[PDB]
Enzyme design. Structure first.
Site, PDB file in Angstrom:
ATOM      1  N   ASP C  55      -0.550  -1.411  -3.016  1.00  0.00           N
ATOM      2  CA  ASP C  55      -0.088  -2.401  -2.051  1.00  0.00           C
ATOM      3  C   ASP C  55       0.233  -3.748  -2.700  1.00  0.00           C
ATOM      4  O   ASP C  55       0.318  -4.765  -2.014  1.00  0.00           O
ATOM      5  CB  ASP C  55      -1.114  -2.555  -0.916  1.00  0.00           C
ATOM      6  CG  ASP C  55      -0.590  -3.349   0.252  1.00  0.00           C
ATOM      7  OD1 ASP C  55       0.224  -2.792   1.019  1.00  0.00           O
ATOM      8  OD2 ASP C  55      -0.991  -4.517   0.412  1.00  0.00           O
ATOM      9  N   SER C  56       0.429  -3.786  -4.014  1.00  0.00           N
ATOM     10  CA  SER C  56       0.954  -4.965  -4.690  1.00  0.00           C
ATOM     11  C   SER C  56       2.479  -4.960  -4.665  1.00  0.00           C
ATOM     12  O   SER C  56       3.116  -3.952  -4.352  1.00  0.00           O
ATOM     13  CB  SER C  56       0.476  -5.029  -6.140  1.00  0.00           C
ATOM     14  OG  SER C  56      -0.912  -5.267  -6.230  1.00  0.00           O
TER      15      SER C  56
END
Ligand SMILES: [Mg+2]
Lengths: 43, 205, 124, 339, 62, 62, 145, 242, 109
Positions: C55-56
């Site tokens: 989720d970066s």
């Protein structure tokens, strides 16, 4: 204010002061991804 | 059908403790007739050390489990007989275990008779062969010398061991008394089996 | 986004005024009643070096330098007095007591740091 | 070959098959607490969009559309009903687990491994041996036991050595059979007092004896050894003595040299390791291993069996409470999938 | 932290110069690079449809 | 983000650091952190943090 | 009671697989075995039935297993019931052993509540104070010395 | 991190399994031991190599996640839409230029020689030779009727560190995979050596996708008009039975 | 009759103990250091080196931790492990004394 109200709850003497602790020499920040770091390394 | 199961597994229980029957058996119908008429059935057994064990099976609707006076006189009259008594087993319906008065006569008789073991048990304790139940590990009483050797090797006292009640069903079938040690061979899903030693404590009733 | 249209007249705490906002290329009826807050960023849905896992995201540095999602963040300092005891003014080391160690009292002008100067940690 | 969404699912990187079906084919029946949408809108109506006592499947949470096609208003409402539970159960999985975690830790934390590998509360035994095997949970290997599923004829076919006509190999095999019988007897009983706990021929053991033999065989410069009666007999004597002295892993090397009596509960602890060594070091399996290589194998087995023991003074009651209360977060997350 | 209108939030992890970002044959390069693995388990399909629709909106000028 | 010091403001009653960034105090090694450090066996880390870095003192008892 | 045993509400039929040793020594998993999974617990009621094998009655109730079988069977019941809750991404067996061995240490099934801590560690006032209610525990400790 | 513009705690994505963490806004604490006693205890007891194997479940905690799981599959895949899954010497050397290990020897290779992904993976697993043979996550009976599986991809076999055949995916390299590649390396060479291989294989997988590419689009989720008609024939049969 | 409390009770000071060392041939605990014990030995030795600095190690190292680790690995550490077995009600304190210079070290380097 009473002497024995200091003890009971989560914010009381036992749970906040004795079982846990505010400490020095510690840091906090948002964590992030980095694929060049080894698994046992932290940036 | 607790009576039918009792009529067979009480004698299985007498056999499991290595006791010799004194009175010859009677048919199950005669057992039911005696329970309904008299209010109880009595089975006398001979122990190796020549002690006598008397088992009283009481009907669920008998007088001795409702009026404490009848149980009191029955126990008093059976406890002053010319027999080498060592234990009386009073098998009563489970609701009788919660009747405080009956337990009061039981403990009064215990106090008046300090050298006789008096135990009162529910029906389900003798409606099956408890040792042969699959979920029950293999219990075995061990001697005092063997237990002392174990404790001395382990630097332990008898009060540090796990403890088991004397009214525990496998301990009852073994004949475990408070102050005894029971070795339990039990299955394990990590070592394929394990051995523990437990210290027998006082019965709950 | 434009958190308020009268922001310069306000002294608000922990408020952020993002400079540039865009209407979505795919808008909705909700944008007839409120101002949109955001930008129509070009997004690539791809694996690029493993820096966008778990989720970066990977951002263009040029997009940052040009003002993408850039703005000004505001804080407030309200200090009160004790009537006829306290006052606003630059202290003097040779009279006043228990001054904070390692503090920069030299940026004050008549008790207040003048508007337009950069204040760092330890400055009064 | 080219679809990125499929490759993320088929390889296990991210997603599942119902995720693809919901996106592409159809969501299907919304099911809260293992049942359809109950009518909470005025006595027999599920929503204002459906009549009273409606019989169609759509009125009770059946979503006929996929995400890529879009949901209608009633379908989105039923989907929001299901999705609200995921948010409620997530917020509950923190507080409900926290209440249970703190009570489990305050009940179990006093349990500490002493110098006998027992678990006690300051003097009082909780376990005669930690985990009934005395091992650390981080030092376990999942290993298959070969003899468990074999019949009596294919047990004797595979593990009975017929090269030497000696009574030693008659008891080397008979010991293999009665370990097989004891394992079956014990674990068929465990099957009895459970709901769905089947017997397995696979255990977690501290030492993978089979891989130790395979590794050393690979590194051996020898090939197929010639038949040697004294070497085969010697190796059997070496293995039998090693299994006899195995419980001394739980005491020390001082008592092993003195051959002092072993406690009965420590003989039981080494039962699986004694059993596994006799299978993987059987005479039929160690024909191409010299008596010098056997000492290397036996020294490796008890070195790995020493490294897998639980440390003195380890707070194993805190370890157990952490390991049991953590799966309760997922148990609480799936609260609306249970009746 | 940044987010899309489909609820897919994220943390800015790396910032690359304009010469390190990937580019298309026609010169288009992204502002954000998001993992494709954020989609399949979350089913934020409105974000992918928005990109498909908005791609033709920009060229059509609408 | 936050990182403090070997020293700073201290509570008058407990003798421990103040709470968090706004008071320029320390951060909390709570009840669950001591469970994890105890589970790991790291007892010299508990002395360093909960005694040397928080409020550890010397009590004299007859 | 009319046509049933007390305590059980529904009695379904389930298909279960079990192992068995053949006459040739092989171990085979038998999938064609039918049992009864009831809704509600009465071990003694099922123990009196002649259509049920009384030696392999599996209750999900720890209290009922402890009542009829004993502390050792109740220890095995706590292990089986925690493992059911744990799922299949569950902890090692030695962490279920720790729970059951603690809860059955005194010969009775004690709880992980304040009452259970009192039974196992009554003289540990400071542990017992830290759990739930320091003032009540401290007051009792002083009068009891 | 010497860049003054960085304010975050950065860690490898494969280290997130220890803390149940991700990068959607999580914050983590960090304190550095200063006393000698606590600084000895940090190295010998509390190093994260001591919890590669879970104490809760007795299995590995770490592995590949989301880019090296699909990246390992793409690298070890037998065939590509471009034909055979091979790369020349220059690109094979480029997979090892980030792994931070000792580079292998490519001297016995012409510039035009072609190396497949199984050869490149083998050059890395030779340092910790293990034995592995399981069916990958890629093969499923659920997809078998509707897909043509390659017979060289549905049987992963490693002997002495050489990947003989099969693809590497969640079964072999995934996080939490009992009996996987890193679980076997830990049991034979130690959990610290297993952590090095998780990193080294993650760089091979990511450097393959560095010019293989991996994307997801909207058309990946779209049924054909003929297939959409087949799905609503299936749903209409459900509503007919209802 | 149970009369007023006497001085014979009311003692708060526990009586002193006698350290009873189990003979070396009767020791029951393992001859291998636990990870906890090795860590504690290295930490104590490193702190004492930070105090004194006097070691018999031949090699030269720039850290107390490295010197302590090499002392443990080379079997030159001037410490002993005392494993307290029991405290007897009659006053004895039965312990086992272990020499870490002749035990198995679990740590690696
Ligand atoms: Mg988060």
């Amino acid at each position: 204010p009473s002497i024995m109200r200091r003890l009971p709850r989560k914010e009381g003497r036992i749970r906040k002061s004795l079982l846990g602790s505010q400490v020095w020499s510690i840091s906090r920040s948002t964590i992030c991804g980095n694929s060049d770091l080894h698994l046992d390394e932290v940036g | 059908m607790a009576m039918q199961k009792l009529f067979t597994y009480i004698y299985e229980f007498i056999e499991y403790r290595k006791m010799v029957l004194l009175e010859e058996k009677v048919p199950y119908d005669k057992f039911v007739q005696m329970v309904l008429n008299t209010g109880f059935f009595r089975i006398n057994a001979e122990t190796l050390n020549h002690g006598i064990v008397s088992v009283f099976i009481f009907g669920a609707n008998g007088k001795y489990v409702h009026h404490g006076g009848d149980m009191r006189t029955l126990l008093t009259n059976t406890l002053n007989e010319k027999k080498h008594y060592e234990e009386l087993i009073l098998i009563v319906d489970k609701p009788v275990l919660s009747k405080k008065n009956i337990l009061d006569i039981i403990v009064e008789q215990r106090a008046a008779n300090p050298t006789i073991v008096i135990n009162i048990y529910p029906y389900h304790l003798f409606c099956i062969n408890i040792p042969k139940v699959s979920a029950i590990p293999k219990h075995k009483l061990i001697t005092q010398e063997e237990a002392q050797e174990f404790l001395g090797r382990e630097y332990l006292q008898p009060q540090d061991l796990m403890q088991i009640s004397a009214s525990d069903p496998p301990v009852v079938w073994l004949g475990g008394r408070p102050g005894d040690f029971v070795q339990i061979e039990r299955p394990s899903e990590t070592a394929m089996h394990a051995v523990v030693i437990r210290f027998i404590t006082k019965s709950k009733i | 986004g434009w958190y308020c249209f009268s922001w310069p007249y306000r002294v608000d705490m922990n408020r952020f005024f993002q400079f540039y906002n865009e209407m979505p290329l795919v808008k909705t009826i909700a944008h007839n009643y409120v101002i949109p807050n955001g930008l129509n960023t070009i997004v690539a849905y791809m694996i690029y070096g493993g820096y966008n896992q778990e989720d970066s995201v990977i951002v263009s540095q040029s997009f940052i330098d040009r003002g993408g999602f850039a703005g000004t963040f505001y804080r407030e300092e309200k200090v009160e007095l004790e009537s006829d005891i306290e006052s606003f003014g630059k202290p003097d080391p040779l009279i006043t007591k228990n001054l904070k160690p390692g503090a920069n009292y030299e940026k004050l002008v008549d008790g207040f740091v003048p508007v337009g100067t950069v204040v760092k940690k330890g400055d009064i | 070959e080219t679809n990125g969404l499929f490759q993320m699912v088929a390889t296990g990187a991210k997603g599942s098959n119902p995720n693809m079906i919901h996106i592409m084919a159809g969501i299907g029946q919304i099911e809260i607490n293992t049942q359809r949408i109950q009518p909470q809108f005025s006595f027999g109506r599920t929503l204002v969009y459906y009549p009273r006592f409606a019989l169609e499947a759509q009125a009770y949470g059946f979503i006929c559309n996929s995400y890529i096609a879009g949901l209608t208003s009633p379908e989105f409402i039923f989907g929001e009903m299901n999705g609200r539970f995921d948010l409620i159960n997530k917020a509950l999985s923190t507080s409900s687990t926290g209440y249970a975690n703190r009570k489990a830790i305050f009940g179990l934390q006093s349990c500490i491994v002493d110098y006998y590998r027992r678990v006690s509360i300051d003097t009082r035994l909780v376990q005669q041996l930690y985990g009934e095997d005395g091992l650390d949970a981080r030092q376990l290997e999942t290993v298959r036991f070969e003899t468990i599923m074999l019949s009596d004829q294919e047990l004797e076919d595979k593990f009975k050595y017929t090269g030497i006509q000696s009574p030693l190999f008659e008891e080397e095999f008979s010991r293999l059979k009665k370990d097989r019988d004891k394992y079956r007897q014990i674990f068929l009983n465990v099957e009895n007092f459970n709901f769905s706990q089947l017997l397995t021929d696979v255990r977690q053991v501290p030492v993978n004896v089979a891989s130790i033999v395979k590794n050393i065989l690979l590194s051996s410069t020898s090939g197929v050894l010639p038949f040697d009666e004294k070497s085969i007999l010697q190796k059997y004597a070496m293995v039998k003595t090693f299994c006899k002295n195995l419980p001394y892993v739980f005491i020390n090397n001082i008592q092993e040299r003195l051959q002092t009596p072993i406690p009965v509960y420590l003989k039981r602890a080494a039962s699986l390791m004694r059993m596994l060594i006799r299978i993987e070091l059987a005479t039929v399996k160690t024909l191409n291993i010299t008596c010098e290589q056997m000492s290397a194998i036996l020294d490796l087995i008890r070195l790995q069996y020493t490294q897998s023991l639980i440390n003195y003074g380890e707070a194993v009651g805190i370890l157990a409470a952490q390991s049991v209360s953590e799966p309760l977060t997922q148990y609480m997350l799936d609260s609306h999938h249970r009746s | 932290k940044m987010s899309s209108r489909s609820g897919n939030k994220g943390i800015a992890a790396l910032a690359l110069p304009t010469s390190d970002m990937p580019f298309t044959e026609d010169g288009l390069q992204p502002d954000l690079i998001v993992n494709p693995h954020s989609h399949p388990s979350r089913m934020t399909n409105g974000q992918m449809i928005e990109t498909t629709v908005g791609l033709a909106n920009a060229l059509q000028g609408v | 983000r936050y990182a403090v010091a070997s020293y700073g403001p201290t509570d008058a009653l407990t003798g421990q650091p103040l709470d968090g960034k706004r008071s320029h105090g320390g951060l909390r090694l709570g009840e669950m952190e001591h469970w994890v450090l105890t589970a790991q066996g790291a007892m010299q880390t508990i002395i360093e943090k909960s005694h040397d870095d928080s409020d550890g003192c010397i009590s004299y008892i007859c | 009671t009319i046509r049933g045993i007390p305590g059980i509400k529904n009695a379904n039929v389930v298909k279960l697989m079990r192992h068995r040793v053949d006459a040739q020594g092989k171990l085979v998993r038998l999938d064609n075995i039918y049992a009864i999974k009831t809704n509600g617990t009465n071990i003694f009621g099922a123990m009196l039935d002649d259509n049920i094998d009384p030696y392999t009655i599996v209750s999900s109730s720890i209290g009922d297993t402890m009542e009829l079988y004993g502390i050792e069977a109740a220890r095995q019941k706590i292990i089986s019931e925690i493992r059911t809750v744990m799922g299949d991404k569950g902890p090692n067996h030695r962490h279920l052993l720790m729970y059951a061995d603690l809860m059955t240490r005194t010969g009775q099934v004690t709880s992980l509540e304040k009452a259970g801590l009192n039974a196992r560690e009554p003289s540990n006032v400071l542990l017992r104070m830290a759990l739930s209610s320091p003032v009540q525990v401290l007051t009792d400790a002083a009068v009891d010395s | 991190l010497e860049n003054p513009k960085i304010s975050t705690f950065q860690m490898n994505v494969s280290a997130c399994a220890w803390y149940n963490a991700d990068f959607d806004g999580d914050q983590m604490n960090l304190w550095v031991p200063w006393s000698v006693m606590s600084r000895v205890e940090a190295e010998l007891l509390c190093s994260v190599r001591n919890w590669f194997i879970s104490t809760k479940s007795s299995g590995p905690v770490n592995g590949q996640v989301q880019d090296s799981t699909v990246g390992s599959f793409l690298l070890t895949r037998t065939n590509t839409p471009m034909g055979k899954n091979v790369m020349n010497k220059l690109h094979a050397m480029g997979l090892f230029q980030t792994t931070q290990t000792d580079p292998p020897c490519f001297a016995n290779y012409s510039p035009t020689d072609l190396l497949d992904g199984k050869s490149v993976v083998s050059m890395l697993l030779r340092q910790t030779p293990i034995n592995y043979q399981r069916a990958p996550t890629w093969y499923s009976e659920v997809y078998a009727p509707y897909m043509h599986y390659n017979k060289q991809d549905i049987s992963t076999q490693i002997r002495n560190g050489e990947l003989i055949e099969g693809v590497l995916d969640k079964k072999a390299v995934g996080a939490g995979s009992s009996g996987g590649i890193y679980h076997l390396i830990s049991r034979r060479y130690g959990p610290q050596q297993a952590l090095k291989m998780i990193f080294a294989t993650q760089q091979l997988a990511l450097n393959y996708v560095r010019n293989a590419g991996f994307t997801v689009s909207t058309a990946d989720m779209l049924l054909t008009p003929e297939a959409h008609q087949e799905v609503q024939e299936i749903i209409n049969e459900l509503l007919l039975e209802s | 009759i149970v009369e007023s409390p006497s001085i014979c009770e009311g003692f708060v000071q526990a009586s002193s103990q006698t350290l009873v060392i189990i003979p070396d041939n009767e020791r029951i605990t393992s001859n291998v250091l636990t990870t906890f014990e090795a860590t504690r030995l290295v930490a104590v030795r490193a702190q004492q080196l930070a105090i004194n600095g006097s070691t018999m190690l031949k090699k030269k190292y720039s850290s107390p931790i490295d010197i302590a680790k090499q002392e443990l690995f080379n079997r030159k550490i001037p410490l002993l492990v005392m494993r307290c077995i029991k405290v007897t009600p009659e006053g004895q304190k039965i312990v086992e004394i272990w020499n870490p210079r002749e035990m198995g070290i679990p740590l690696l380097d």
